[PDB]
Ligand binder design. Structure first.
Ligand SMILES: [Mg+2]
Ligand SMILES: [Mg+2]
Ligand SMILES: [Mg+2]
Ligand SMILES: [Mg+2]
Ligand SMILES: [Mg+2]
Ligand SMILES: [Mg+2]
Ligand SMILES: [Mg+2]
Ligand SMILES: [Mg+2]
Ligand SMILES: [Mg+2]
Ligand SMILES: [Mg+2]
Ligand SMILES: [Mg+2]
Ligand SMILES: [Mg+2]
Ligand SMILES: [Mg+2]
Ligand SMILES: [Mg+2]
Ligand SMILES: [Mg+2]
Ligand SMILES: [Mg+2]
Ligand SMILES: [Mg+2]
Ligand SMILES: [Mg+2]
Ligand SMILES: [Mg+2]
Ligand SMILES: [Mg+2]
Ligand SMILES: [Mg+2]
Ligand SMILES: [Mg+2]
Ligand SMILES: [Mg+2]
Ligand SMILES: [Mg+2]
Ligand SMILES: [Mg+2]
Ligand SMILES: [Mg+2]
Ligand SMILES: [Mg+2]
Ligand SMILES: [Mg+2]
Ligand SMILES: [Mg+2]
Ligand SMILES: [Mg+2]
Ligand SMILES: [Mg+2]
Ligand SMILES: [Mg+2]
Ligand SMILES: [Mg+2]
Ligand SMILES: [Mg+2]
Ligand SMILES: [Mg+2]
Ligand SMILES: [Mg+2]
Ligand SMILES: [Mg+2]
Ligand SMILES: [Mg+2]
Ligand SMILES: [Mg+2]
Lengths: 56, 185, 159, 171, 51, 223
RNA sequence: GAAAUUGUUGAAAGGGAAGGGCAUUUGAUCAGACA
RNA sequence: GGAAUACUGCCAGCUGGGACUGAGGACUGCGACGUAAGUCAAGGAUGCUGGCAUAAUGGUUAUAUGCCGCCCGUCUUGAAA
RNA sequence: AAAUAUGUAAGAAGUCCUUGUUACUUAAUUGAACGUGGACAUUUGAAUGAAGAGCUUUUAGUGGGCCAUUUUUGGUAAGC
RNA sequence: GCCCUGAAAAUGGAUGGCGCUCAAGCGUGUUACCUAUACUCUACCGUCAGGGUUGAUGCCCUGACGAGUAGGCAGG
């Protein structure tokens, strides 16, 4: 016997039950995939300004 | 008929009293429900809800936690409040004196405050001294270090701890855990 | 059998505009992109490398990385009942600076300067736009304009 | 409904290019002023480039009959839509007032040609100045000298269900 | 324990909004406006009665 | 203890006496403010006519909307807009400041609601009889000016008539003064809707759409 | 010594099933309130 | 030329008839009317009078009348089938 | 080349001044990042609403569907 | 336009029925009326919520809400 193949029916209705959320925004985001050079460099740059800020 | 914009007869997701039958716990509540209601004292409110909390929500504060908190600047002389039980920690050596307000103290922890010259206070005693909660430090244990939390959010590439009854190589180490056998997580 | 490919259904989408073909003018290579910029993704069918998948065409997002010939871009894609964060690696021919931010920045300058000339004179600010308000009372005159009265028109065939 | 006649005047919204834009007027037959304003736009949008978004209604004023107790002959010109297509018509209505005639204009076009309100545009209504400028026999009947007719077979609407004598139609 | 409708129940109509007293007493539910003689010019009635 | 009550009592009795005559002062000033506002427009219309010009009224800033359709089988876009105007229930109604921003919320909502321009006499009769406030959620009947003054006082508006004045004038606190009013739960029109079949435009056979001045006759049969 | 099921007696109803619901009429019956 | 009237709208204008409801239970509140002392229709019904004091109201039940009611249970997109 | 649908934006996680850090990058003390210190909170930079927002764990049932409007494919068509 | 012809099926029969002809038909307009578990106001049950206050599962004040198979929980 043949039976239904696909339909999108109701899926939006279920979606909006709990749904649409948001992106969950944060300050200081994930650095995943940033250039590894300038990542290496940005490590020592941050180390420098923290050492300097403690020297005061 | 109404077109409601929110689920009807939905009850507040917060505990209204502790799930315990401990009659002395009830008393401590009965105190702080009076305290919270008749005072401003935001401290009292927090403690009120704190008394309702479940064991999983009242993780022990060790005696070293209290010690490192007292090292905050200007905190040295405050009196620590821990709604929950406080534990002893051998790892520290020099322990300050101060005073602690807690539900329960372990043997070691009691001897370790006292032998440092400090004092052990229950929350009703803390209440009489600080009715508005004056000069208190409130401490909470690390509830997210629990074992079970290792397994929450288990997934591919999620880095969590699988639920496993036995551990080692040949236990869920092979196909899908390593590039060499199939794929990797 | 069914066919869903990476470029499936992009026939018109990736076509180049009428009579704008061939070489890409130099302005697109001289633009400069900074992390936190807002960019408009429109794929360029003459440049096959660094190409967005058809879904992101028309979508706008923020650039999280900057590389030699390309920028990484962040797009929020809804899948299921929530959005998921996507990071896109796109070559600078597929990218353009969003002009929408550009109006906003220009209004913050204008807003800051309005608040200054107001605070220097100590008077009211009101920097938030109001929508169009209904209208105000008018007196239209009849001098030169006598209302020229109109009638519906009989049916007529023009064929 | 029960009709009134309105004067609706309006104009394009003024622009810096063109303040003082030309004004247009229609006599609109309607039941109230809300329909009237709409029906102003309805034809204006047929005759001119305006939407009631890009225009405004300068004035709306009712029009009361000039001589409400004077029996007049009216010519009426209409465009209406049948089922198979669209048609222009001339009919005559003999009545006391311009609204009175437009009321029974719509009854006729409904009854005889099954043409609802939405189908019909009233092209012109004009009192007929001189008798025997009247073309239509079903008016001219009543324009004769010393016109008298009877009303035979008179039906007296009865008050109570039962009557105690055989009724008569006599008049 | 009871909503009372100020548009009936004069006690309440006075409880909110005094000047109810003044209103009634000065009438001004009535109050004829003044009498002006402006006449509409010419062109207005020329176009009013137009075809 | 026995004397200091007449202290606190005679105090408030005077601060009541004071708040009272302030409302008595204000409400007198509103009466003049309306009476002269309308009277100007009338003459301005006369003046235009004598000058052979046409006086065009300003478009209304204030519109009252009541939902005349049931809560079943509503499209999702209008269903949102209907909630965002707080009409979730048949015959319930609120006020809307008229701008292009809410004008399109009247376009999308049009087949489910009847709306128009309410008269002072309506707004008054609405707020006195059906007026309710929003105080920590709960729906509070407005029976004493203190209830208003408590919640709306920070804006001015210590009197039920200051609410009514704030509404009909729009102006500065309309957003807050309006949102304080609990949506008006109206009964069905006593005397009927006057059309056989409701859901069709007012232009078309009545009930649903903008009936302009005619909203007033309606609401007063429901109210 | 229950139920199905049956005899007698007593009350009742019944123009092609019976039984149900709301409501009152009628008949039968019965509780509740004062020294 | 001076009115009237229709229409539409407003009155914190006055008044006749009917219906359902009487929650609450010392006092506290907002008021109104008074020169005043007081009074009130102002944060929920009191006053006056009559009959009965029992199957009368009422409950139960059987019957009668009006309108209404397909046989449950299950599978099912769909069951009185 | 519409309509309806659709992406992004409407600030304190913002704006401006000053001038620290670095192995990156520049011919260059240039830039790129991330900072110290100073300034600006009334309307805190459209509307509406908001009866609260956010977050975690855990587990039932389901995974034969069917119908109406409009869009719409196969079929002469169908209660297909 | 309405009316007629065009217009042939199997038990006896359905504008729902009766019946209706300046309709009880067709087109259209105007009112008055009838009545849903829907709207409005009150009383009551319950559910949720907010607030007060020393049978504590307590007492009190206030508002909103009430459909349900499969299913989950809860009080009995
Ligand atoms: Mg199969
Ligand atoms: Mg399937
Ligand atoms: Mg294919
Ligand atoms: Mg293109
Ligand atoms: Mg193009
Ligand atoms: Mg390649
Ligand atoms: Mg009636
Ligand atoms: Mg009807
Ligand atoms: Mg037996
Ligand atoms: Mg036998
Ligand atoms: Mg019997
Ligand atoms: Mg029987
Ligand atoms: Mg009932
Ligand atoms: Mg006159
Ligand atoms: Mg009148
Ligand atoms: Mg009582
Ligand atoms: Mg009885
Ligand atoms: Mg039956
Ligand atoms: Mg079965
Ligand atoms: Mg099966
Ligand atoms: Mg069955
Ligand atoms: Mg499952
Ligand atoms: Mg199955
Ligand atoms: Mg079927
Ligand atoms: Mg027949
Ligand atoms: Mg019939
Ligand atoms: Mg007739
Ligand atoms: Mg008829
Ligand atoms: Mg029922
Ligand atoms: Mg409670
Ligand atoms: Mg609380
Ligand atoms: Mg409580
Ligand atoms: Mg207590
Ligand atoms: Mg308790
Ligand atoms: Mg209980
Ligand atoms: Mg309690
Ligand atoms: Mg309900
Ligand atoms: Mg339920
Ligand atoms: Mg429910």
């Amino acid at each position: 016997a043949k039976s239904k193949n696909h339909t999108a029916h109701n899926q939006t209705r279920k979606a909006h039950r709990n749904g649409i959320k948001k992106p969950k925004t944060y300050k200081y985001p994930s650095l995943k995939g940033v250039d590894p050079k300038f990542r290496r460099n940005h490590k020592h740059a941050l180390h420098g300004t923290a050492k300097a800020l403690a020297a005061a | 008929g109404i077109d409601h914009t929110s689920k009807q007869h939905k009850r507040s997701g917060h505990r209204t009293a502790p799930k315990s039958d401990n009659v002395y716990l009830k008393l401590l509540v009965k105190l702080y429900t009076f305290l919270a209601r008749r005072t401003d004292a935001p401290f009292n409110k927090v403690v009120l809800k704190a008394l309702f909390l479940s064991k999983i929500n009242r993780p022990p504060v060790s005696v070293s936690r209290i010690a490192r908190a007292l090292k905050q600047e200007g905190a040295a002389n405050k009196t620590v409040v821990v709604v929950g039980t406080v534990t002893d920690d051998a790892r520290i050596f020099e322990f300050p004196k101060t005073t602690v307000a807690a539900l329960r103290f372990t043997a070691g922890a009691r001897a370790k405050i006292v032998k440092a010259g400090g004092e052990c206070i229950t929350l009703d005693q803390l209440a009489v001294r600080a009715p508005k909660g004056q000069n208190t430090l409130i401490l909470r244990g690390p509830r997210n270090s629990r074992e079970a939390v290792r397994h929450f959010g288990m997934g591919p590439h999620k880095g969590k701890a699988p639920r496993i009854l036995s551990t080692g190589r040949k236990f869920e180490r092979a196909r899908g855990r390593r590039r060499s056998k199939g794929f990797k997580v | 059998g069914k066919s869903h490919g990476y470029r499936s259904r992009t026939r018109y989408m990736f076509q180049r505009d009428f009579r704008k073909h061939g070489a890409v003018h130099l302005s697109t290579y001289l633009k400069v992109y900074k992390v936190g910029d807002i960019v408009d993704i429109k794929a360029n069918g003459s440049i096959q490398k660094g190409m967005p998948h058809k879904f992101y065409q028309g979508k706008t997002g923020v650039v999280y990385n900057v590389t030699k010939s390309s920028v990484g871009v962040i797009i929020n894609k809804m899948v299921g009942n929530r959005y998921l964060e996507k990071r896109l690696n796109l070559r600078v021919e597929h990218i353009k600076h969003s002009k929408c931010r550009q109006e906003f920045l220009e209004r913050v300058k204008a807003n800051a300067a309005k608040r200054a000339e107001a605070k220097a004179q100590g008077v009211a600010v009101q920097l938030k736009r109001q929508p169009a308000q209904p209208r105000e009372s008018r007196i239209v005159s009849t001098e030169g304009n006598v209302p020229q009265t109109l009638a519906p028109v009989p049916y007529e065939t023009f064929i | 409904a029960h009709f009134k006649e309105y004067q609706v005047i309006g104009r394009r919204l003024p622009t810096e290019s063109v303040p003082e834009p030309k004004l247009f007027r229609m006599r609109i037959f309607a039941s109230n002023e809300v329909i009237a304003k709409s029906r102003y736009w309805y034809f204006l949008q047929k005759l001119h480039k305006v939407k009631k978004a890009s225009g405004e209604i300068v004035s709306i004023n009712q029009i009361n009959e000039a001589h409400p107790t004077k029996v007049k002959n009216f010519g009426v010109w209409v465009r209406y839509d049948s089922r198979s297509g669209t048609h222009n018509m001339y009919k005559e209505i003999r009545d006391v007032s311009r609204v009175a005639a437009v009321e029974t204009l719509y009854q006729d076009m409904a009854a005889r040609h099954r043409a609802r309100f939405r189908s019909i545009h009233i092209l012109k209504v004009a009192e007929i100045e001189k008798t025997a400028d009247v073309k239509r026999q079903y008016v001219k009947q009543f324009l004769t000298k010393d016109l008298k007719f009877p009303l035979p077979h008179r039906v007296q609407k009865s008050t109570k269900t039962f009557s105690y004598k055989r009724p008569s139609t006599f008049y | 324990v009871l909503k009372k409708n100020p548009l009936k129940n004069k006690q309440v109509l006075l409880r909110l909004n005094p000047y109810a007293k003044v209103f009634a007493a000065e009438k001004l539910g009535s109050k004829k406006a003044e009498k002006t003689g402006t006449k509409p010019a010419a062109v207005f009635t020329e176009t009013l009665k137009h075809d | 203890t026995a004397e200091q009550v007449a202290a606190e009592r005679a105090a408030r009795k005077a601060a009541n006496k004071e708040k009272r005559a302030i409302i008595l002062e204000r409400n007198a000033a509103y009466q003049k403010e309306y009476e002269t506002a309308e009277r100007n427009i009338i003459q301005a219309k006369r003046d235009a006519k004598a000058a052979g010009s046409y006086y065009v009224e300003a478009q209304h800033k204030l519109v009252f909307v009541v939902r005349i359709k049931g809560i079943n089988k509503i499209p999702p876009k209008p269903r949102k807009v209907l909630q965002l105007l707080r009409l979730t229930r048949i015959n319930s109604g609120t006020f809307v400041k008229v701008t292009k921003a809410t004008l399109e919320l009247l376009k999308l909502i049009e087949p489910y609601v009847a709306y128009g321009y309410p008269s002072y006499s309506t707004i008054r009769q609405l707020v006195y009889k059906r007026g309710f406030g929003k105080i920590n959620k709960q729906r509070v009947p407005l029976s004493d000016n203190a209830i208003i003054e408590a919640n709306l006082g920070k804006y001015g508006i210590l009197s039920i008539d200051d609410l009514i004045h704030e509404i009909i004038t729009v102006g500065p606190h309309f957003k807050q003064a309006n949102n304080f009013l609990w949506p008006f739960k109206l009964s069905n029109p006593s005397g009927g809707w006057g059309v056989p079949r409701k859901f069709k435009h007012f232009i078309q056979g009545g009930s649903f759409g903008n009936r302009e001045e005619f909203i007033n006759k309606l609401v007063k049969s429901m109210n």
